[PDB]
Each structure stands twice: as C-alpha cells, then as structure tokens.
Write a structure and sequence with these properties.
Chain A: Homodimer. Binds cooperatively to DNA as a pair of dimers. 2 copies of one chain form a homodimer. Helix content of chain A is about 70%, strand content about 0%. Chain A is an all-alpha fold. The relative contact order of chain A is 0.12. Chains A and B meet through helix 5, helix 6, helix 7 and helix 8 of A and helix 6, helix 7, helix 8 and helix 9 of B. Bound molecules: dequalinium.
C-alpha cells in the first residue's frame, strides 16, 4: 500500500516510463524485495484496477442524482472530467500500451460496464432501442475518455460544456 | 538544408530510439551540423521535436487534401477522416515519441500552448467538414467550433484507448461512432 500509494502519485505526476521501481522504492523506504505484484506492469495494472473501482464506487454513490438513464449517461461523463480517480492515470495508461490480454481484459470490461448498465437498463426503460450495446458501450466509453484526456489543460467549465454537447449528440444519435 | 537535415535525422532518431533517449549530440553529429546551429534553429530538443511535429501535421493535412477526394459529401468526409485517423496512426512511427513527449511537457504551458496550436490544426479538419456540411444542408450545426472539438477528441479517444482489439473491429467501431455521431446532429 505504501508502494501502491506512491506509485499512483508518481504515475499521475510523472510518466509511466519516467517513474521506475528504483524511484518508487526510494519514495516509500520498503526495499526492492518487498515489491514482489510480480513486474512493474503488475504493480501498475493493480493500481488501475484499484482506481477504476474507487471511481466505479464513487459513481454508484453519485448516480442517484440521475433520475433517467439519459441523465445517468450525461452525468457519468460529466463526473469523468471532475473525478480524482482513474482518468488522471490515462496518460500513463496510454504510455503503458505502447511500452508493452490478461488482467487487462477484466479492466476494459469494468471500464465499459457503467455504459453497459446505462444502455441495457435504457432498453428496459425504453428510452432508446440500441441492439449492439457492447459496441456502443466501448464507443461511448472511449469517446468520453478522449474528451476527458485530450483536453486536460483548458478551462474546466468549457470541458463540462463540451462533454454535455457530446452526450446530447451521442444519445440523440442512438434514438 | 541543414535545418531540414537536422529535422530529418532527428525524426529518424526519435522514431528509432524515442524522444527521451535521442540526444542533441546525436542529432548534431549524425546530421553533420553543430550544437550551435541546432541551438540557433530550435533552441532546445523540445522545440526541435515541436517543428518535427509541425511538419508532420503539415504532411498530414496534405494527405487529407488528397485523400478526401474519395469522400464526396461532408458526411462521407467525416466518416473517412475518422477512419484515416485510426488506421494511419496504427502504423505511425512517431506516435510513440509523441506519447513520450506529451506525457512529459504537458505540465509545461509554453510547450502545451504550441501543442494545442498543433492539435487545433487537426481540429480544423472537422471544422471544415462541419461548416461545408452546413452550407450543403447535410446538417445544421449552430455551434460548429464546439462540435469540432468534440468530434476530434471523441475520435482521439476511440483511436487511443481501443488498443486491446483487432484492427478490423476498431474500424467497425469507429464507423459505428461516425454513424451515431452524425445521426445526432440534424
Ligand atoms: C503525421 C500524422 C499522422 C497521423 N496518422 C495523425 C493522426 C491523427 C492526428 C495527427 C496525425 N498526424 C500529425 C501529427 C502532428 C503532431 C500533433 C499531435 C500531437 C499533439 C498532442 C496530442 N495529445 C494531446 C492533445 C493530449 C494528450 N493527452 C496526448 C497524449 C498522447 C499523445 C498525444 C496527446
């Protein structure tokens, strides 16, 4: 945990490659032997799992505010911009994909799961008629991740504005 | 020419060994130039890499001006541009030295300003697609500058975060997105 906490801080601030197990160990005393997650990957892939969940929990605690699935969608994407979980590691996560199908598969599904529920319960609630949810969930998720990640610099309220103009276009698109 | 040769050699070096690993001395010696001349044209490795990127955007835009003839309507151009963005990046060699470079100088605003200059140039492609689409009545976007930024960044996310998939599927999705997106505009 002293490892897992320092890593997150190092992976968020500096890169994936730019923070190595040398600097992580020196950051939390616990000697290199203690770091045995097997590889640097495993350490990192474990953090993503943690953070993806800390987000997914926060989303459940905050989705009550949404009455309809339409609102659930809008909101989920809005919250993605503001959260302190997962989405601030996406630079690392990108840098990770270049530098290297396993525990990754269980994450990518947990990552799209929030949209799966929304679109599934959305068909049950009759708000739209999407027939291939897995496609639309992976699309929506990644598009959103794009809007969050490829604008992390400019004014936060513009960001929120853009994401909502997105959510509108997308949902309107499905229906 | 020694500006171009520096750029060209630098590009290959970056492609070959990444951004961080490539030194200025390498670029210098391999291009039969000088640290002095490199400094006079680019000041830093960071800027040198930025001009490499400026060129690559210019080259990209040229591809698009030629490639977009295969797309008659702006609806078609939107579909295409997104495919290209996905496909052409899949085998883009600088893409790794870009990721490296970005996830390093994005906290620095002097650089990040110049990188948005670049990224805005990419967004411009969508701005044109949407604008001409308004003029042709393929759709009615009142807020084009926003919709462009969205399209571009939605496609970037699809391009970048899909990674765990087969390349024939990604195209399927990217086109599905292209479909869904356009069909929520009118
Ligand atoms: C040649 C060429 C070839 C292509 N297939 C191509 C495809 C799409 C766009 C440009 C292309 N170009 C042109 C490439 C010119 C360079 C401009 C793009 C770099 C600007 C930074 C973009 N960026 C931002 C904003 C935010 C991020 N978190 C981030 C993370 C990782 C990587 C990039 C990031």
């Amino acid at each position: 945990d002293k490892i897992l906490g320092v890593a997150k801080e190092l992976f968020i601030k500096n890169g994936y490659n730019a923070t190595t197990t040398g600097e992580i160990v020196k950051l939390s005393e616990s000697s290199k032997g203690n770091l045995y997650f097997k590889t640097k990957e495993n350490l990192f892939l474990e953090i993503l799992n943690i953070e993806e969940s800390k987000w997914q929990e926060q989303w459940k605690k905050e989705q009550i505010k949404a009455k309809t699935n339409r609102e659930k969608f809008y909101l989920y994407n809005e919250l993605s911009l503001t959260t302190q979980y997962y989405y601030p590691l996406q630079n690392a996560i990108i840098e990770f994909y270049t530098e290297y199908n396993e525990k990754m598969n269980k994450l990518e599904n947990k990552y799209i799961d929030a949209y799966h529920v929304i679109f599934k319960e959305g068909n049950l609630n009759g708000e739209w008629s999407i027939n291939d949810v897995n496609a639309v969930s992976k699309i929506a998720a990644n598009a959103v991740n794009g809007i969050v990640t490829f604008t992390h610099e400019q004014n936060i309220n513009e960001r929120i504005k853009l994401m909502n103009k997105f959510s509108q276009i997308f949902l309107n698109g499905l229906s």
